[PDB]
Symmetry: C3
Subunit: 126 residues, 3 copies
Protein backbone atom coordinates (compact mmCIF):
# COMPACT_ATOMS: atom_id res chain seq x y z
CA UNK A 1 0.00 0.00 0.00
CA UNK A 2 2.64 2.51 1.11
CA UNK A 3 3.78 2.33 -2.51
CA UNK A 4 4.64 -1.17 -3.68
CA UNK A 5 1.93 -2.21 -6.15
CA UNK A 6 3.59 -0.30 -8.99
CA UNK A 7 6.87 -1.93 -7.88
CA UNK A 8 5.56 -5.51 -7.62
CA UNK A 9 4.05 -5.31 -11.12
CA UNK A 10 7.42 -4.31 -12.59
CA UNK A 11 9.23 -7.03 -10.69
CA UNK A 12 6.63 -9.47 -12.00
CA UNK A 13 7.32 -8.26 -15.54
CA UNK A 14 11.06 -8.76 -15.17
CA UNK A 15 10.40 -12.34 -14.02
CA UNK A 16 7.86 -13.03 -16.77
CA UNK A 17 10.37 -11.75 -19.34
CA UNK A 18 13.33 -13.60 -17.82
CA UNK A 19 11.45 -16.91 -17.54
CA UNK A 20 9.96 -16.67 -21.05
CA UNK A 21 13.29 -15.81 -22.68
CA UNK A 22 14.89 -18.63 -20.72
CA UNK A 23 12.23 -21.03 -22.01
CA UNK A 24 12.62 -19.85 -25.61
CA UNK A 25 16.34 -20.66 -25.53
CA UNK A 26 15.53 -24.10 -24.08
CA UNK A 27 12.92 -24.68 -26.82
CA UNK A 28 15.32 -23.57 -29.59
CA UNK A 29 17.81 -26.12 -28.31
CA UNK A 30 15.10 -28.82 -28.33
CA UNK A 31 14.12 -27.97 -31.90
CA UNK A 32 17.71 -28.10 -33.17
CA UNK A 33 18.15 -31.36 -31.29
CA UNK A 34 15.00 -32.82 -32.85
CA UNK A 35 16.03 -31.71 -36.36
CA UNK A 36 19.52 -33.16 -35.86
CA UNK A 37 18.01 -36.45 -34.64
CA UNK A 38 15.47 -36.51 -37.46
CA UNK A 39 18.27 -35.91 -39.92
CA UNK A 40 20.32 -38.87 -38.70
CA UNK A 41 17.29 -41.15 -38.83
CA UNK A 42 16.60 -40.10 -42.43
CA UNK A 43 20.20 -40.89 -43.48
CA UNK A 44 20.25 -44.36 -41.88
CA UNK A 45 16.74 -45.30 -42.98
CA UNK A 46 17.54 -44.33 -46.57
CA UNK A 47 20.95 -45.93 -46.58
CA UNK A 48 19.40 -49.15 -45.26
CA UNK A 49 16.63 -48.89 -47.86
CA UNK A 50 19.21 -48.67 -50.66
CA UNK A 51 21.21 -51.51 -49.18
CA UNK A 52 18.12 -53.72 -49.19
CA UNK A 53 17.33 -52.79 -52.80
CA UNK A 54 20.91 -53.31 -53.92
CA UNK A 55 20.66 -56.76 -52.32
CA UNK A 56 17.33 -57.72 -53.92
CA UNK A 57 18.92 -56.70 -57.24
CA UNK A 58 21.84 -59.07 -56.83
CA UNK A 59 19.82 -61.92 -55.33
CA UNK A 60 17.37 -61.95 -58.22
CA UNK A 61 20.34 -62.24 -60.53
CA UNK A 62 21.74 -65.11 -58.46
CA UNK A 63 18.59 -67.22 -58.44
CA UNK A 64 18.14 -66.67 -62.16
CA UNK A 65 21.65 -68.04 -62.65
CA UNK A 66 21.31 -70.93 -60.18
CA UNK A 67 18.08 -72.17 -61.74
CA UNK A 68 19.75 -71.97 -65.12
CA UNK A 69 22.78 -74.01 -64.08
CA UNK A 70 20.66 -76.67 -62.37
CA UNK A 71 18.61 -76.99 -65.54
CA UNK A 72 21.72 -77.57 -67.65
CA UNK A 73 22.96 -80.15 -65.16
CA UNK A 74 19.68 -82.04 -65.00
CA UNK A 75 19.74 -81.96 -68.79
CA UNK A 76 23.19 -83.58 -69.02
CA UNK A 77 22.28 -86.33 -66.56
CA UNK A 78 19.39 -87.19 -68.87
CA UNK A 79 21.83 -87.62 -71.75
CA UNK A 80 24.35 -89.36 -69.50
CA UNK A 81 21.76 -91.70 -67.98
CA UNK A 82 20.55 -92.28 -71.53
CA UNK A 83 24.00 -93.09 -72.92
CA UNK A 84 24.78 -95.18 -69.84
CA UNK A 85 12.76 -71.25 -57.04
CA UNK A 86 10.91 -67.95 -56.77
CA UNK A 87 12.23 -64.63 -58.01
CA UNK A 88 12.34 -61.76 -55.51
CA UNK A 89 13.01 -58.83 -57.84
CA UNK A 90 9.66 -57.34 -56.82
CA UNK A 91 10.63 -56.70 -53.20
CA UNK A 92 11.39 -53.00 -52.88
CA UNK A 93 12.43 -50.77 -50.01
CA UNK A 94 11.18 -47.21 -50.16
CA UNK A 95 13.09 -44.13 -49.02
CA UNK A 96 11.85 -41.27 -46.91
CA UNK A 97 12.13 -37.56 -47.57
CA UNK A 98 11.67 -35.31 -44.55
CA UNK A 99 14.32 -32.79 -45.51
CA UNK A 100 11.64 -30.13 -45.76
CA UNK A 101 10.44 -30.75 -42.22
CA UNK A 102 14.03 -30.79 -40.96
CA UNK A 103 14.75 -27.45 -42.66
CA UNK A 104 11.51 -26.06 -41.28
CA UNK A 105 12.54 -26.98 -37.74
CA UNK A 106 15.82 -25.10 -38.11
CA UNK A 107 14.08 -22.03 -39.54
CA UNK A 108 11.64 -21.93 -36.62
CA UNK A 109 14.54 -22.25 -34.18
CA UNK A 110 16.27 -19.32 -35.87
CA UNK A 111 13.06 -17.26 -35.94
CA UNK A 112 12.28 -17.65 -32.24
CA UNK A 113 15.05 -15.09 -31.65
CA UNK A 114 12.49 -12.67 -33.08
CA UNK A 115 10.04 -13.65 -30.36
CA UNK A 116 12.26 -12.74 -27.41
CA UNK A 117 11.08 -10.12 -24.95
CA UNK A 118 12.97 -6.83 -24.65
CA UNK A 119 11.33 -5.34 -21.58
CA UNK A 120 11.19 -1.53 -21.38
CA UNK A 121 13.03 -0.77 -18.14
CA UNK A 122 11.78 1.70 -15.54
CA UNK A 123 14.76 3.52 -14.07
CA UNK A 124 12.91 4.18 -10.83
CA UNK A 125 13.17 0.46 -10.08
CA UNK A 126 16.44 -0.37 -11.80
CA UNK B 1 7.88 10.21 -13.40
CA UNK B 2 5.56 12.84 -14.89
CA UNK B 3 3.25 9.89 -15.51
CA UNK B 4 4.81 7.12 -17.58
CA UNK B 5 5.34 4.16 -15.24
CA UNK B 6 1.71 3.07 -15.57
CA UNK B 7 2.15 3.52 -19.35
CA UNK B 8 5.44 1.61 -19.67
CA UNK B 9 4.01 -1.37 -17.78
CA UNK B 10 1.08 -1.61 -20.20
CA UNK B 11 3.36 -1.29 -23.21
CA UNK B 12 5.49 -4.04 -21.70
CA UNK B 13 2.40 -6.22 -21.36
CA UNK B 14 1.41 -5.71 -24.98
CA UNK B 15 4.92 -6.79 -26.02
CA UNK B 16 4.98 -9.78 -23.65
CA UNK B 17 1.60 -10.88 -25.04
CA UNK B 18 2.55 -10.25 -28.68
CA UNK B 19 5.89 -12.07 -28.39
CA UNK B 20 4.43 -15.04 -26.48
CA UNK B 21 1.53 -15.48 -28.91
CA UNK B 22 3.99 -15.20 -31.78
CA UNK B 23 6.14 -17.92 -30.20
CA UNK B 24 3.16 -20.20 -29.60
CA UNK B 25 2.25 -20.10 -33.29
CA UNK B 26 5.88 -20.88 -34.18
CA UNK B 27 5.88 -23.80 -31.70
CA UNK B 28 2.58 -25.18 -33.04
CA UNK B 29 4.10 -25.18 -36.50
CA UNK B 30 7.18 -27.03 -35.17
CA UNK B 31 5.02 -29.64 -33.47
CA UNK B 32 2.94 -30.31 -36.59
CA UNK B 33 6.16 -30.47 -38.58
CA UNK B 34 7.67 -32.97 -36.14
CA UNK B 35 4.52 -35.14 -36.15
CA UNK B 36 4.40 -35.06 -39.95
CA UNK B 37 8.09 -36.04 -40.12
CA UNK B 38 7.65 -38.74 -37.49
CA UNK B 39 4.71 -40.09 -39.44
CA UNK B 40 6.69 -40.43 -42.66
CA UNK B 41 9.53 -42.17 -40.86
CA UNK B 42 7.09 -44.67 -39.32
CA UNK B 43 5.60 -45.50 -42.75
CA UNK B 44 8.98 -46.06 -44.45
CA UNK B 45 10.52 -47.94 -41.53
CA UNK B 46 7.52 -50.28 -41.37
CA UNK B 47 7.27 -50.72 -45.11
CA UNK B 48 10.98 -51.59 -45.22
CA UNK B 49 10.52 -53.96 -42.27
CA UNK B 50 7.77 -55.82 -44.13
CA UNK B 51 9.82 -55.89 -47.30
CA UNK B 52 12.70 -57.50 -45.43
CA UNK B 53 10.38 -60.09 -43.85
CA UNK B 54 8.67 -60.84 -47.15
CA UNK B 55 12.16 -61.43 -48.56
CA UNK B 56 13.36 -63.71 -45.75
CA UNK B 57 10.15 -65.69 -46.32
CA UNK B 58 10.89 -66.27 -49.99
CA UNK B 59 14.62 -66.84 -49.54
CA UNK B 60 14.08 -69.57 -46.96
CA UNK B 61 11.80 -71.26 -49.46
CA UNK B 62 14.45 -70.92 -52.18
CA UNK B 63 17.29 -72.47 -50.21
CA UNK B 64 15.06 -75.31 -49.09
CA UNK B 65 14.33 -76.00 -52.75
CA UNK B 66 17.92 -75.58 -53.97
CA UNK B 67 19.32 -77.97 -51.36
CA UNK B 68 16.63 -80.44 -52.34
CA UNK B 69 17.43 -80.31 -56.05
CA UNK B 70 21.18 -80.62 -55.47
CA UNK B 71 20.53 -83.68 -53.33
CA UNK B 72 18.52 -85.34 -56.10
CA UNK B 73 21.25 -84.53 -58.60
CA UNK B 74 24.07 -85.85 -56.45
CA UNK B 75 21.92 -88.94 -55.98
CA UNK B 76 21.54 -89.57 -59.72
CA UNK B 77 25.26 -89.15 -60.36
CA UNK B 78 25.83 -91.90 -57.81
CA UNK B 79 23.56 -94.21 -59.80
CA UNK B 80 25.01 -92.97 -63.09
CA UNK B 81 28.62 -93.32 -61.93
CA UNK B 82 27.61 -96.74 -60.60
CA UNK B 83 26.01 -97.88 -63.86
CA UNK B 84 28.90 -96.38 -65.84
CA UNK B 85 23.41 -74.27 -46.81
CA UNK B 86 21.92 -72.48 -43.81
CA UNK B 87 18.28 -71.53 -43.47
CA UNK B 88 17.50 -67.87 -42.71
CA UNK B 89 13.82 -68.11 -41.80
CA UNK B 90 14.68 -66.89 -38.30
CA UNK B 91 15.78 -63.42 -39.39
CA UNK B 92 12.95 -61.04 -38.58
CA UNK B 93 12.46 -57.31 -38.98
CA UNK B 94 10.30 -55.65 -36.36
CA UNK B 95 7.89 -52.78 -36.95
CA UNK B 96 7.47 -49.63 -34.94
CA UNK B 97 4.28 -48.12 -33.57
CA UNK B 98 4.48 -44.44 -32.62
CA UNK B 99 1.03 -43.52 -33.84
CA UNK B 100 0.06 -42.62 -30.29
CA UNK B 101 2.94 -40.18 -29.94
CA UNK B 102 2.17 -38.70 -33.35
CA UNK B 103 -1.49 -38.19 -32.40
CA UNK B 104 -0.40 -36.70 -29.09
CA UNK B 105 1.77 -34.14 -30.87
CA UNK B 106 -1.17 -33.00 -33.00
CA UNK B 107 -3.46 -32.73 -29.97
CA UNK B 108 -0.93 -30.58 -28.12
CA UNK B 109 -0.57 -28.36 -31.18
CA UNK B 110 -4.34 -27.93 -31.31
CA UNK B 111 -4.55 -27.29 -27.56
CA UNK B 112 -1.93 -24.53 -27.50
CA UNK B 113 -4.61 -22.29 -29.01
CA UNK B 114 -6.10 -22.48 -25.52
CA UNK B 115 -2.88 -21.08 -24.08
CA UNK B 116 -2.86 -17.86 -26.10
CA UNK B 117 -2.94 -14.54 -24.27
CA UNK B 118 -5.96 -12.25 -24.65
CA UNK B 119 -4.68 -9.11 -22.97
CA UNK B 120 -7.30 -6.88 -21.29
CA UNK B 121 -6.85 -3.55 -23.06
CA UNK B 122 -6.71 -0.21 -21.26
CA UNK B 123 -8.47 2.39 -23.39
CA UNK B 124 -6.42 5.20 -21.87
CA UNK B 125 -3.40 3.81 -23.74
CA UNK B 126 -5.09 2.36 -26.81
CA UNK C 1 -10.13 5.71 -14.51
CA UNK C 2 -11.89 5.61 -11.14
CA UNK C 3 -9.13 3.19 -10.20
CA UNK C 4 -8.89 0.17 -12.47
CA UNK C 5 -5.67 0.56 -14.48
CA UNK C 6 -3.56 -0.78 -11.62
CA UNK C 7 -6.12 -3.61 -11.33
CA UNK C 8 -6.27 -4.50 -15.04
CA UNK C 9 -2.48 -4.74 -15.23
CA UNK C 10 -2.41 -7.25 -12.37
CA UNK C 11 -5.23 -9.28 -13.89
CA UNK C 12 -3.28 -9.26 -17.15
CA UNK C 13 -0.23 -10.56 -15.31
CA UNK C 14 -2.17 -13.40 -13.73
CA UNK C 15 -3.40 -14.40 -17.21
CA UNK C 16 0.05 -14.07 -18.80
CA UNK C 17 1.49 -16.26 -16.03
CA UNK C 18 -1.35 -18.80 -16.15
CA UNK C 19 -1.25 -19.12 -19.95
CA UNK C 20 2.56 -19.35 -20.11
CA UNK C 21 2.77 -21.98 -17.36
CA UNK C 22 -0.03 -23.88 -19.08
CA UNK C 23 1.92 -23.78 -22.35
CA UNK C 24 5.15 -24.92 -20.68
CA UNK C 25 3.44 -28.03 -19.33
CA UNK C 26 2.02 -28.72 -22.82
CA UNK C 27 5.50 -28.27 -24.35
CA UNK C 28 7.14 -30.56 -21.76
CA UNK C 29 4.63 -33.23 -22.68
CA UNK C 30 5.42 -32.74 -26.39
CA UNK C 31 9.15 -33.04 -25.75
CA UNK C 32 8.80 -36.25 -23.74
CA UNK C 33 6.49 -37.57 -26.44
CA UNK C 34 9.02 -36.72 -29.17
CA UNK C 35 11.89 -38.32 -27.22
CA UNK C 36 9.82 -41.44 -26.58
CA UNK C 37 8.91 -41.64 -30.29
CA UNK C 38 12.50 -40.99 -31.36
CA UNK C 39 13.63 -43.72 -29.01
CA UNK C 40 11.30 -46.32 -30.50
CA UNK C 41 12.38 -45.41 -34.02
CA UNK C 42 16.05 -45.82 -33.06
CA UNK C 43 15.40 -49.30 -31.60
CA UNK C 44 13.49 -50.58 -34.66
CA UNK C 45 15.81 -48.99 -37.20
CA UNK C 46 18.84 -50.53 -35.49
CA UNK C 47 17.24 -53.89 -34.95
CA UNK C 48 16.27 -53.98 -38.64
CA UNK C 49 19.79 -52.89 -39.60
CA UNK C 50 21.28 -55.80 -37.64
CA UNK C 51 18.75 -58.20 -39.10
CA UNK C 52 19.75 -57.16 -42.61
CA UNK C 53 23.45 -57.56 -41.79
CA UNK C 54 22.91 -60.92 -40.12
CA UNK C 55 21.13 -61.97 -43.33
CA UNK C 56 23.83 -60.72 -45.72
CA UNK C 57 26.28 -62.69 -43.57
CA UNK C 58 24.40 -65.95 -43.99
CA UNK C 59 23.52 -65.41 -47.65
CA UNK C 60 27.14 -64.84 -48.63
CA UNK C 61 27.95 -68.12 -46.95
CA UNK C 62 25.13 -69.84 -48.83
CA UNK C 63 26.15 -68.69 -52.30
CA UNK C 64 29.75 -69.61 -51.60
CA UNK C 65 28.56 -73.11 -50.75
CA UNK C 66 26.10 -73.42 -53.66
CA UNK C 67 28.69 -72.39 -56.24
CA UNK C 68 31.07 -74.90 -54.72
CA UNK C 69 28.61 -77.79 -54.89
CA UNK C 70 27.61 -76.99 -58.48
CA UNK C 71 31.27 -76.98 -59.44
CA UNK C 72 31.80 -80.43 -57.94
CA UNK C 73 28.72 -81.72 -59.74
CA UNK C 74 29.69 -80.29 -63.11
CA UNK C 75 33.09 -81.86 -62.51
CA UNK C 76 31.66 -85.35 -61.93
CA UNK C 77 29.47 -85.18 -65.03
CA UNK C 78 32.63 -84.49 -67.01
CA UNK C 79 34.16 -87.69 -65.66
CA UNK C 80 30.87 -89.55 -66.03
CA UNK C 81 30.26 -88.32 -69.57
CA UNK C 82 33.89 -89.22 -70.25
CA UNK C 83 33.61 -92.75 -68.86
CA UNK C 84 30.24 -93.19 -70.57
CA UNK C 85 26.78 -66.07 -59.00
CA UNK C 86 27.73 -62.81 -57.32
CA UNK C 87 28.73 -62.47 -53.69
CA UNK C 88 26.80 -59.95 -51.58
CA UNK C 89 29.00 -59.80 -48.48
CA UNK C 90 29.66 -56.13 -49.21
CA UNK C 91 26.08 -54.99 -48.63
CA UNK C 92 25.95 -53.39 -45.20
CA UNK C 93 23.22 -51.74 -43.16
CA UNK C 94 24.34 -48.95 -40.87
CA UNK C 95 22.92 -48.19 -37.44
CA UNK C 96 21.90 -44.85 -36.02
CA UNK C 97 22.86 -43.30 -32.71
CA UNK C 98 20.62 -40.48 -31.50
CA UNK C 99 20.71 -41.44 -27.84
CA UNK C 100 22.39 -38.14 -27.07
CA UNK C 101 19.61 -36.14 -28.70
CA UNK C 102 17.00 -38.26 -26.94
CA UNK C 103 18.65 -37.66 -23.56
CA UNK C 104 18.93 -33.97 -24.36
CA UNK C 105 15.19 -33.76 -25.03
CA UNK C 106 14.42 -35.28 -21.63
CA UNK C 107 16.82 -32.92 -19.85
CA UNK C 108 15.21 -29.89 -21.49
CA UNK C 109 11.77 -31.16 -20.49
CA UNK C 110 12.96 -31.52 -16.90
CA UNK C 111 14.62 -28.09 -16.94
CA UNK C 112 11.55 -26.20 -18.17
CA UNK C 113 10.21 -26.58 -14.62
CA UNK C 114 12.86 -23.98 -13.82
CA UNK C 115 11.31 -21.61 -16.34
CA UNK C 116 7.85 -21.51 -14.75
CA UNK C 117 6.45 -18.20 -13.56
CA UNK C 118 5.83 -17.66 -9.84
CA UNK C 119 3.93 -14.38 -9.91
CA UNK C 120 4.31 -12.12 -6.86
CA UNK C 121 0.72 -11.70 -5.65
CA UNK C 122 -0.78 -8.38 -4.63
CA UNK C 123 -3.11 -8.95 -1.70
CA UNK C 124 -5.18 -5.89 -2.58
CA UNK C 125 -6.44 -7.80 -5.62
CA UNK C 126 -6.35 -11.35 -4.30
CL1 LIG D 1 3.05 -7.96 -17.17
CL1 LIG E 1 14.81 -48.97 -41.50
Amino acid sequence: GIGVTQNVLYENQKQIANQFNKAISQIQESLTTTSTALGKLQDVVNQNAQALNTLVKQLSSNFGAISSVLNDILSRLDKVEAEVLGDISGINASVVNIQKEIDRLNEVAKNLNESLIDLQELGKYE
